[PDB]
């Protein structure tokens, strides 16, 4: 059981509560002795018991492991290679569309360097299309299928957590430490991501002019935000600096396109979590340790995972 106040934030309601200052009793190096300790926690790491009493999000479902502080999450490139007596064939046709006869081919030992970047809604740092913003799906005429689009040129996203958190170590057992967030230096400001409006507007124009091949010239076509579901899928959920971000994309996908300044970049607010699950799993949670200082990372958006309703 945790006793939690808000951090001293006095802004708009519920946003005051977006991070909590929780204190609790914890085991020491010695079996017979407890210690009273405190940590900051983000609102999404905790749930209320019923009063100011809280527990971690996972305790009624999963055991939890601290991710070791030394192992990096950086997506280092992997090449996949075939055993002797097998070969990889590479399609060379620039206007290949994911199925059927590729009329131009070469053979290799291994793939190019693939980065295991994990991100929902938008595809980050992955390979550009050879020419045109190519669109792929297994059956476009069915609305239930996802539709990948792959840009011929990157549109650049800058993400940040501008709070300067401190790391703190608590021993919880003989030779075992828990990394809490100690406090925050200076001003509190929201974690967010920016993308340039002209380049995003133009790039969305190019995706429409390719959907106009598969859907015809008469149709006005529209973009909308995701309708509902888990936080993992209703948001551009992704990793930056080793923090996990959950940006509200409703500023990107909000336009309707006719059958026919600018420096103001749009900005997406992002919530953050420390307690997480690999999205294809339940029953084993992970706690991501807190990162010192300000976080920034710069990345290329190079494709999208769209869906269609059924203009």
């Amino acid at each position: 059981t945790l006793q939690c106040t808000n951090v001293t934030n006095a802004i708009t309601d519920d946003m005051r509560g977006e991070l909590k200052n929780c204190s609790f009793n914890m085991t020491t190096e010695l079996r017979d002795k407890k210690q009273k300790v405190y940590s900051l926690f983000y609102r999404l790491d905790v749930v209320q018991i019923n009063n100011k009493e809280y527990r971690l999000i996972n305790c009624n479902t999963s055991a939890i492991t601290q991710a070791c502080p030394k192992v990096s999450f950086e997506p280092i490139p992997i090449h996949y290679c075939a055993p002797a007596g097998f070969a990889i064939l590479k399609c060379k046709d620039k206007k290949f569309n994911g199925t059927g006869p590729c009329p131009s081919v070469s053979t290799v030992q291994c793939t190019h360097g693939i980065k295991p970047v994990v991100s929902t809604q938008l595809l980050l740092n992955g390979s550009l299309a050879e020419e045109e913003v190519m669109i792929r799906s297994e059956n476009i005429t069915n609305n239930a299928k996802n539709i990948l689009v792959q840009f011929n040129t990157p549109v650049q996203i800058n993400c940040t957590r501008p709070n300067n958190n401190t790391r703190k170590s608590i021993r919880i057992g003989p030779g075992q430490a828990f990394y809490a967030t100690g406090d925050i230096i200076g001003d509190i400001r929201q974690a967010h991501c920016n993308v340039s409006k002209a380049t995003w507007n133009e790039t969305l124009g190019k995706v429409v002019k390719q959907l106009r091949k598969h859907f015809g010239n008469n149709t006005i076509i529209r973009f909308a935000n995701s309708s509902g579901g888990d936080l993992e899928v209703t948001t551009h959920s992704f990793n930056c600096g080793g923090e996990f971000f959950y940006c509200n994309t409703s500023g990107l996908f909000n336009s309707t396109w006719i059958s026919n300044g600018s420096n103001d970049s749009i900005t997406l607010p992002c919530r953050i979590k420390q307690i997480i699950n690999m999205w294809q799993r339940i029953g084993q949670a992970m706690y991501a340790p807190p990162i010192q200082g300000v976080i920034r990372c710069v990345s290329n958006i190079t494709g999208l995972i769209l869906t269609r309703d059924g203009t």
Partner: antibody
Amino acid sequence: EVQLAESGGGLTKPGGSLRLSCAASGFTFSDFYMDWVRQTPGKGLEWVSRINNDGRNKWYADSVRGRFTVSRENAKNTLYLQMDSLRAEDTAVYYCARDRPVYRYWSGGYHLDPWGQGVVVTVSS
Amino acid sequence: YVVMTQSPLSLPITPGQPASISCRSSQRLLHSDGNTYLAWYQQRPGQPPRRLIYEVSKLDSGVPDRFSGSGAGTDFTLKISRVEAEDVGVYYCGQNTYLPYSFGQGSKVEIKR
């Protein structure tokens, strides 16, 4: 248009306490740092204390550290200086002023603008 | 602490004439974000200090364009291209880069007669 106004200045004997109020108008007061600055007819302008926007962080001049505490009530758009252990040297006019903005994604530079109307404070037996 | 001082202490000036006020610090006022948080205030008789100039050279809202400000490192100047009757008062340079914030001893303007 932005305005600040102050109340609660007056006379006291030494060793006593006074509380000043400054009230904010024409802006979202919880987006700004705030300062107290005093004028003595001799030495002129002297910085006294600063507070950040959520009130977690506070700073003081050496002449007042621990004798004074600054505090704020964002729900009331209002700032207080609680002065204790006053001396004849604390005789001054006290002005409040507005400092660093903290907009939702971004923090600005430091400022003293605008300044209040000012309150007279006098310390003698 | 960072000391501030202005070189002319009093300026008897004729209405319509230019006037200028040097200000100097004990240490460089360029801050770790790349700005220089010097500013100039004036105080007419019986009134609170009013800011005129900030970040060395930017003007406050509604300040008359006859005011100007310039400088670098430790050495700075106000200049007024012509004084008016509403320019009669006391002028202070000050700095916000380093705590405690600090002010010059200030310079008087008076009507030369």
